[PDB]
């Protein structure tokens with residue numbers, strides 16, 4: 032039983048249907064999974080059954096070679112006896128009344144990530160169930176608006192290249208599908224304040240011209256500052272004494288992934304510069320998403336321990352490391368929120384976002400997200 036049919040964009044159509052994810056006319060289906068890729072209850076169990084042990088087997092090996100996933104994550108496995116080659120496994124969040132927005136955030140990261148994945152393997156049709164709604168507790172109303180919002184933003188934010196044409200939104204119960212069809216109906220000043228007081232300023236200057244107490248740079252494993260365009264602009268403006276200081280502070284240290292080192296500002300108008308070695312997008316890896324949230328937390332954390340009052344973040348990793356810009360905007364914003372609410376800060380009160388005037392995708396990404404957050 033089909034319900035509605037909606038156009039997103041030329042060639043692309045969103046279809047709410049009733050049906051069984053096991054037997055559907057699409058390239059790939061999305062599984063509501065957990066952190067271990069274990070499929071012991073729910074639909075994922077329905078899927079495992081039909082697929083046979085092959086389905087679990089690959090998962091098990093995926094979990095032993097890449098390790099457990101975390102909420103807000105998605106990977107891709109063999110399908111076994113299913114009418115597909117692959118299943119996309121989306122690990123949605125567990126639902127908590129207190130951490131609502133972070134839950135909304137992670138449910139949506141999962142959906143976004145799973146669209147990325149299907150797009151990577153060039154699929155042109157996908158089936159998505161109401162992830163999280165079952166045994167992870169996510170109230171059916173918010174769950175499905177979030178999924179639909181996620182999908183909208185996928186085609187709204189960058190039209191530039193897309194393999195997907197058919198997105199099915201599925202379930203076997205009639206009410207979940209009613210939700211979905213209601214959800215689709217509903218779905219179709221750069222300055223926020225978190226609960227605990229700290230505010231985030233959208234700012235459209237070169238990072239070199241920033242005037243905060245702390246500024247973050249993104250830099251490679253051997254710490255040369257001349258390579259990336261962000262690093263280059265700081266190097267140029269500060270003086271070469273920043274390269275000399277950085278190489279000397281990172282002397283006795285086996286520079287790894289998620290490494291943060293502090294230097295003084297020289298020519299620059301800030302007091303200190305935090306230099307950070309950000310992870311490659313690696314296709315949206317679990318690691319990449321941890322390590323980056325961690326850097327973000329550490330730089331704010333450090334800053335509170337220096338008793339400083341303000342810090343300037345650029346779109347780190349959205350250049351050569353290949354982070355889809357929207358995903359990042361929304362990664363760092365969540366993290367500033369999550370962090371501010373959970374701590375009682377004494378001196379940190381202002382996170383600025385420095386976006387090059389000529390970087391419209393980054394200006395765009397952060398605006399849209401700021402708009403949602405003020406909405």
Ligand SMILES: Nc1ncnc2c1ncn2[C@@H]1O[C@H](COP(=O)(O)OP(=O)(O)OC[C@H]2O[C@H](O)[C@H](O)[C@@H]2O)[C@@H](O)[C@H]1O
Pocket residue numbers: 236237238239249250251252258259260261262264309345346347348349350351352353385386387390393
């Ligand atoms: N002057 C500026 N002011 C503000 N933003 C800027 C500026 N210049 C560039 N951006 C934005 O800055 C963003 C980041 O661009 P990238 O410099 O590649 O850093 P990355 O974090 O992607 O990683 C690449 C580096 O790290 C790796 O180890 C590589 O070896 C490189 O050294 C882009 O969105 C720019 O639009």
